[PDB]
Amino acid sequence: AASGSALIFDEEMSRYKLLWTDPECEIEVPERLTVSYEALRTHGLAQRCKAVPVRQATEQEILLAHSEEYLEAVKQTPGMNVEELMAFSKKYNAVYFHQNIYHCAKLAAGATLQLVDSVMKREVRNGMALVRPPGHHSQRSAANGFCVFNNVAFAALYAKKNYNLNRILIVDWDVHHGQGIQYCFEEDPSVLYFSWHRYEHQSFWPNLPESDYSSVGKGKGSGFNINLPWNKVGMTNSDYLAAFFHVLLPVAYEFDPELVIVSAGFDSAIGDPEGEMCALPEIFAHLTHLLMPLAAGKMCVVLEGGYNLTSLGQSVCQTVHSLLGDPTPRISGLGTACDSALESIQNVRNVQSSYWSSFKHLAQSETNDIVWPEPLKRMPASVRTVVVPPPGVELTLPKNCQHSGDISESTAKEVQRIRDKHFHDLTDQNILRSLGNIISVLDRMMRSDEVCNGCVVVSDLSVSVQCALQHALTEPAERVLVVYVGDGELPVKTNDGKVFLVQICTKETEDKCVNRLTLCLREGESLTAGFMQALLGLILPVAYEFNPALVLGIVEETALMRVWGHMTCLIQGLARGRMLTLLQGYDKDLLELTVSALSGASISPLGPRAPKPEDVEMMEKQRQRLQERWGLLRCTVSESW
Numbered sequence: 266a267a268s269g270s271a272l273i274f275d276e277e278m279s280r281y282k283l284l285w286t287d288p289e290c291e292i293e294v295p296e297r298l299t300v301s302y303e304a305l306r307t308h309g310l311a312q313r314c315k316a317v318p319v320r321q322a323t324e325q326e327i328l329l330a331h332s333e334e335y336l337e338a339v340k341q342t343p344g345m346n347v348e349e350l351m352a353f354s355k356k357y358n359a360v361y362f363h364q365n366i367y368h369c370a371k372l373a374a375g376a377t378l379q380l381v382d383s384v385m386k387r388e389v390r391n392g393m394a395l396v397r398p399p400g401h402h403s404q405r406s407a408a409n410g411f412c413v414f415n416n417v418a419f420a421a422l423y424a425k426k427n428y429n430l431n432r433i434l435i436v437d438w439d440v441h442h443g444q445g446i447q448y449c450f451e452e453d454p455s456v457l458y459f460s461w462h463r464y465e466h467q468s469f470w471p472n473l474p475e476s477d478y479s480s481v482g483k484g485k486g487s488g489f490n491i492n493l494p495w496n497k498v499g500m501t502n503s504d505y506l507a508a509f510f511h512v513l514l515p516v517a518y519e520f521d522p523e524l525v526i527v528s529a530g531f532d533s534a535i536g537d538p539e540g541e542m543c544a545l546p547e548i549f550a551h552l553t554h555l556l557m558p559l560a561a562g563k564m565c566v567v568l569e570g571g572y573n574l575t576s577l578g579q580s581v582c583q584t585v586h587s588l589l590g591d592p593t594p595r596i597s598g599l600g601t602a603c604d605s606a607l608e609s610i611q612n613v614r615n616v617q618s619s620y621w622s623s624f625k626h627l628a629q630s631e632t633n634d635i636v637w638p639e640p641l642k643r644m645p646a647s648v649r650t651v652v653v654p655p656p657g658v659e660l661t662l663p664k665n666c667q668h669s670g671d672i673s674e675s676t677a678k679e680v681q682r683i684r685d686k687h688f689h690d691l692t693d694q695n696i697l698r699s700l701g702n703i704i705s706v707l708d709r710m711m712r713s714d715e716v717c718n719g720c721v722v723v724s725d726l727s728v729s730v731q732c733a734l735q736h737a738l739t740e741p742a743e744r745v746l747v748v749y750v751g752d753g754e755l756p757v758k759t760n761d762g763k764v765f766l767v768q769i770c771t772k773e774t775e776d777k778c779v780n781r782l783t784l785c786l787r788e789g790e791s792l793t794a795g796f797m798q799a800l801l802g803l804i805l806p807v808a809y810e811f812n813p814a815l816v817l818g819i820v821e822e823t824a825l826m827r828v829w830g831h832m833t834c835l836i837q838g839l840a841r842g843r844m845l846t847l848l849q850g851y852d853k854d855l856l857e858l859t860v861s862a863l864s865g866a867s868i869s870p871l872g873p874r875a876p877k878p879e880d881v882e883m884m885e886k887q888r889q890r891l892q893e894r895w896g897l898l899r900c901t902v903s904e905s906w
């Protein structure tokens with residue numbers, strides 16, 4: 266399986282710039298590449314990436330997306346003087362030309378194609394191209410918005426042609442609408458385009474009616490264009506994550522792309538003079554992380570915009586950190602999206618309800634100078650994952666996993682201390698072994714930056730859960746998220762706000778308070794889709810708002826775990842990836858799947874469908890019950906009294 270992350274960069278693309286006065290173009294500077302690469306080197310990230318050389322896109326490759334007349338006209342700009350370059354620039358909107366920009370435009374596109382080849386040939390797991398000029402405004406016969414050729418549209422058209430892909434997701438999180446990409450794939454159902462963008466009721470550049478939520482695609486492509494307009498500035502981490510949980514990710518996992526391409530403009534970051542948004546550079550660690558389970562991890566990140574040199578460098582680093590598998594930073598202060606964002610979200614969900622299963626219940630009444638703190642260091646763990654299989658079982662482990670059954674003297678004293686106080690008449694040395702394992706693994710996870718998560722197979726659930734949870738609460742971990750697949754009650758108290766409990770059970774149970782989420786899904790062929798809808802639409806929003814310091818996963822032996830890998834990967838967005846999983850009984854496959862997802866490996870796609878209406882009803886009842894306490898659950902504007 267593929268390993269490593271490509272970083273594609275060349276300083277030649279910094280060798281064109283604006284040569285006359287134009288306030289609408291001044292911000293697009295060579296130093297955007299310089300500062301970004303240097304920030305990657307400063308933090309040791311470039312050195313851990315596979316450097317893949319740029320090349321020129323050929324004429325034939327350019328003609329995949331652009332007309333011969335437009336290519337021919339651009340091909341003559343290297344021979345033009347400044348006067349003629351200015352006159353040529355004025356034929357287009359918000360773009361400048363330079364003797365070297367045609368050369369750099371072919372490098373930006375070739376760099377992108379190099380990135381696609383590296384990922385699709387399995388030479389790397391994923392990667393990023395740092396390119397100039399950007400691409401996403403470029404159109405079949407026009408330069409636009411600092412873009413000459415459409416780098417990301419090339420990438421999808423090239424991957425279609427040369428790898429015969431049928432499903433490609435393009436995520437455009439630049440703060441501007443990528444209308445060139447939308448036009449390119451408007452009628453094509455094989456490419457799903459998502460864009461959020463500052464819109465302000467069409468008063469923000471490029472001022473297009475078809476940038477609104479109502480443009481869903483055309484003809485065979487209806488439903489495969491998703492526009493989410495931001496109609497106010499100042500959008501926050503909660504707005505962006507609400508967009509992902511309630512619009513993008515439900516559609517992305519249902520579409521099941523074979524490749525993901527990100528139009529990665531960081532002018533959507535705090536401090537940018539174009540976007541005027543408020544999301545922290547750390548949010549891009551999570552936008553990247555939440556998309557990484559798709560397409561077996563095959564993600565190509567392509568630089569678009571981003572103009573505040575500081576937020577630019579920090580956001581590029583958060584993205585590459587996540588591409589490299591480094592633990593995600595904790596996002597504090599999350600809550601409801603603002604009213605304007607909830608309006609945009611509910612409007613796109615409603616027009617998209619004709620096309621996507623996650624939204625189909627909405628269609629019938631029966632169914633329903635700026636400054637911010639510098640990002641903390643993100644260092645990978647020595648051993649990412651420790652594993653404790655039953656005594657005797659030896660397993661084949663990824664290179665970043667270790668067994669860990671060696672109980673120390675201090676740990677062994679705590680186990681009998683705990684036994685002597687809370688479990689008098691317990692003699693079973695198999696259970697006492699597992700509690701030595703839990704405490705030893707937990708202490709490595711929390712006290713060290715060099716073990717991140719772990720998995721322990723256990724005999725008795727009640728005793729193991731108590732010591733795991735209690736030893737975590739005394740460490741102390743301020744808050745603990747518990748995710749439990751099974752039935753019955755556990756020694757878990759949710760009456761102090763330090764624990765939130767997600768339970769996925771078989772019998773319908775009454776849910777009393779707002780620190781428990783109970784999901785009883787109907788047994789049958791549609792359990793997989795229902796679980797994924799619950800995970801993206803309920804579990805992740807609450808977990809992200811809760812912001813735990815540790816995640817405790819628990820599976821009872823009696824218990825449809827072909828989604829367990831996706832949850833384990835996605836849930837590592839919380840608690841900087843610090844998750845302890847307790848598997849009750851030995852299941853060879855479940856244990857290797859758990860270890861692989863905890864270790865950061867890529868997981869198999871889910872492939873195919875639609876969930877039970879009874880299940881969606883149950884899930885929306887949970888939303889109605891919880892969203893006043895946990896506002897990140899909301900995907901509609903609330904009613905004013």
Ligand SMILES: CN(CCCC(=O)NO)CCC(=O)Nc1ccccc1
Pocket residue numbers: 289290358359399402410411439440441470530532539569570571
């Ligand atoms: C800065 N904008 C491009 C951003 C591209 C980007 O970063 N894409 O990701 C262009 C602003 C502009 O030209 N406004 C305007 C247009 C016509 C007449 C008067 C004013």
Ligand SMILES: [K+]
Pocket residue numbers: 437438439440441442443460461462
């Ligand atoms: K966008």
Ligand SMILES: [K+]
Pocket residue numbers: 450451452453454455456457458482486489490
């Ligand atoms: K499309």
Ligand code: NA
Pocket residue numbers: 354355357358359360
């Ligand atoms: Na102009």
Ligand SMILES: [Zn+2]
Pocket residue numbers: 439440441530532569570571
């Ligand atoms: Zn932009």
